[PDB]
Each structure stands twice: as C-alpha cells, then as structure tokens.
C-alpha cells in the first residue's frame, strides 16, 4: 500500500530551524510530487509548496518563500520540510501529500507533524490512576482510566495494553491550567465482572520531553 | 486573489437524511486545456485528511456511492446521500486549475440523533498524586447527546466556582455521541479539609439531575 509516515512532534525556541520528515512507501517515490500542506490550531488547510522528485525542482505560495525549504533523499525515499528563523506562527500541524499529477490531486497524506515554537522548556506529564467504580460481584459496566497531568507542548499519546484494548475508550482533549500547562484524561469501560481477570495498563508517551510511562490502573 | 468559499460552516444532519455542502470560487476552475480540477477532502478528527472526489464528479478508489459531486464553473456541490455516523468531519474543496493549489475554509458536518442520557462516574484522587502535593477529583459524563450538559461540584455541600476543567470528545463515529470530563483540581491541604465530594449533572436526558460522590478516605 501506498504511505507516508512522518517524524515525531517538536519543540523548538523562536529564531531556531526545525527540519521534518516523510518517509514514502509503496510506490516509485521518484515518479510523484511531493507537497507540503499547513494546519495552523482551528484553521484552514494551507498548500506551502512542492519538490518534484524526478527533477529537484521546488516551487513555493507566496506566503512559504524565504524561511522555507524542501530537500529529498531519493535512495531513502524520505522528504524533507525545513523551516528556519522559526516564529510563533510557524507553531501548526505540517502534512506531507503525494500528488498524483494525472488529475493534479493529493491522493494519499501523511499521518501530520507537530512543531510548536516556543521560549518555555519542555515538561513531561505525571501519570496517575483513576481507579475502577465498581467490584464483581454487582455487575454491569464499570469505567477506569489515567489521569496525564501537568506538560507541555502538545501533543500525547495514550493507549491501553499496548494497543489491544480500543473499544470504548475516550482519550479527552487537553486543557490548559492557568499554570500554563496541559492537562488531560483518558477513560475506558469494561465488564465489571472482568476486573478480577483483567489487567488494565494504560502507556503514555510525550515525546518531547522523552517521558514513557505505563500505569497499571486496579481499584 | 483565487478565494474559495464554502457554505455552510456547520452543517447538522440527521441519519438517513441528505448533506448538501456548496463551494464557490471566486475564479473559474475550467481549465485553457477542458478539464475542471476541483476536489474534495474529508478530515476526521485527529486525523489527517483522505482524498474523496476528483476532478468535480469522480470518487477516488474505496469512497462509496453515496458521496457525489456536481457543478460548474465557479459554483460546486459535493451531496452525501443517506448520510451515516462514520461520515462525521471537516469536508474541504480544493482547486488546481490556477497556480497556486487552494482549499476552502472547510465545513463540519455534525450528526444530529435522539437525546441520549449520560452514564455519570466519580474518580476521587489517588494516592500517588495526593503524595505529591494536590489532588484532581474527575467526574466523566459518557455517551449523551446532545452536547450541552451542566455540571456542578459540591465538596461538603457547598457548590464550588473557578477550579474545575471541562473537556468534551468529538461526536463518536459509531453512535455520534458525546463525553465530557469535569476536574476539580485543590491543593491536597484544601482537599484533607472536607469530606464529601460530589458532582450533579444536569442534562436533557435524565428527569432530574444525577449525582455521584464519595467520601474522603473510603
């Protein structure tokens, strides 16, 4: 299958260069556009440029001539967003989107890549449980969950059981504390009955600050 | 300047019922060559966009018939017939016919289905968090509709102001759905003070509010 996976979320300071990937795969790399779209906090998609890859050639919107360059590794089949002299309004989601030329479209995107541009230092969050509502032994439906608290930037990941369990879970967006930093909570629900069974670990990883951490969450 | 317009912003739908969302472009898409490259893209939330409609009427590989787009010129409709839980997002037009490629501003289609009760859990803190210093209490309202709900804290009775969050989920994509956590954040000095904690959800489903609580230590 056709896919574009990108790099990681970032943290940078004002004035520093950020340089994003996109690796491809599942295609021949050289033989599409490759270009790069922006998503600013609640806005419209921005179409910034394209690198075509048989050629080398980059072509920039008017608002993405100047801080703004494209480079490819053909034999990696990676592309590259580079953005120096980095402002707050850089701070946005940045996608990759392959172009197929034939009817001059983005048929397939990458997953997006986070870059805040901050002057704060990052933090990671403290995990902790919030324990089971029920016992066994009166049934029905019980919620549990992990409470993610106190970092910054944006964005978390939270999963449970290394990803197998999916199916009722509601990882909440986050909110800012006036502390300035974010807080959030994920929550599940599960048979009742199930607790004496089943174990519940859910694992949280906020990149940029390199914190991983799984927390067994029981009564 | 190429603007695209789209209308409306927000667009409520029932299940089974019709999506009609208009984009306009303030030049036209007909390409000196014949073609018309206008498109469309659904993104969901969290999620990056995926290509729909190409070129006015074509659907891509996978989207079903249900999607159909139509139109000329300036003025395009993109209709999704016997709409469906999973069809929950921000639609974008785009055009390619003038350098450089636009999208329009975007357009949410939200689910409109019957009002739907909120099962109420209380979480009092734990003890690794009151360990360090300040205990978060969280009230979960899960699956309601519609989105509006009213959430009150007591601690011993009194109704609390000014140090609770609110957080709600997007519409779920299976039931279309909301919910919502409250947080009561104290320092643990505050928290140690009282005993009963409370919180009261008012909401268009229930008859008459519901309230979940614990008490301190238990």
């Given at each position: ?8 979320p ?36 921005k ?26 590794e ?17 701070t ?19 997953q997006?890549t986070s ?10 969050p403290s ?28 964005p978390?990941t ?28 994920s929550?599940?629900?599960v ?6 069974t ?13 914190t ?8 | ?7 409306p ?6 299940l ?5 969302i208009?984009?306009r ?8 060559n ?13 999620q990056?966009?995926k290509f ?9 590989s ?5 999607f159909?787009?139509?139109?000329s ?16 997002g ?20 939200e ?29 979960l ?44 954040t ?9 005993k ?23």
């Amino acid at each position: 299958q056709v896919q574009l996976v990108q790099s990681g979320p970032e943290l940078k300071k004002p004035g520093e260069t950020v340089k994003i990937s996109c690796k491809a795969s599942g295609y021949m790399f050289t033989n599409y556009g490759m270009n790069w779209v922006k998503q600013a906090p609640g806005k419209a998609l921005k179409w910034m440029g394209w690198i075509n890859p048989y050629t080398g050639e980059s072509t920039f919107a008017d608002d993405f001539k100047g801080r703004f360059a494209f480079f490819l590794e053909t034999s990696a089949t990676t592309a590259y967003l580079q953005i120096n002299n980095l402002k707050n309004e850089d701070t946005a989601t940045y996608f990759c989107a392959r172009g197929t030329t034939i009817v001059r479209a983005f048929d397939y995107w990458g997953q997006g890549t986070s870059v805040t541009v901050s002057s704060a230092s990052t933090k990671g969050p403290s995990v902790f449980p919030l324990a089971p509502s029920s016992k066994s032994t009166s049934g029905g439906t019980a919620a549990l969950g992990c409470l993610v608290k106190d970092y910054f930037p944006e964005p978390v990941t939270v999963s449970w059981n290394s990803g197998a369990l999916t199916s009722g879970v509601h990882t909440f967006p986050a909110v800012l504390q006036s502390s300035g930093l974010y807080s959030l909570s994920s929550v599940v629900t599960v048979p009742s009955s199930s607790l004496g069974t089943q174990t519940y670990i859910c694992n949280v990883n906020h990149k940029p600050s390199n914190t991983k951490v799984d927390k067994k969450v029981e009564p | 300047e190429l603007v695209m317009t789209q209308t409306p912003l927000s667009l409520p739908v029932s299940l089974g019922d019709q999506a009609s969302i208009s984009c306009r472009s303030s030049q036209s898409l007909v390409h000196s060559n014949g073609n018309t490259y206008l498109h469309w893209y659904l993104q969901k939330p969290g999620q990056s966009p995926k290509f729909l409609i190409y070129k006015v009427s074509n659907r891509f590989s996978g989207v079903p018939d249900r999607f159909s787009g139509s139109g000329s010129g300036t003025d395009f409709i993109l209709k999704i017939s016997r709409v469906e839980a999973e069809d929950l997002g921000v639609y974008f037009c785009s055009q390619s016919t003038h350098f450089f490629p636009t999208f329009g501003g975007g357009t949410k289609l939200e689910i409109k289905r019957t009002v739907a009760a909120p099962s109420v859990f209380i979480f009092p803190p734990s003890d690794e968090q009151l360990k360090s210093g300040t205990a978060s209490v969280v009230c979960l309202l899960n699956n309601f509709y519609p989105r509006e709900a009213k959430v009150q804290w007591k601690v011993d009775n009194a109704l609390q102001s000014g140090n609770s969050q609110e957080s709600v989920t997007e519409q779920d994509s299976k039931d279309s759905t909301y919910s919502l956590s409250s947080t009561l954040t104290l320092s643990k000095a505050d928290y140690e003070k009282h005993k009963v904690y409370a919180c009261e959800v008012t909401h268009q489903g229930l008859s008459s509010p519901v309230t979940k609580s614990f008490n301190r230590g238990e």
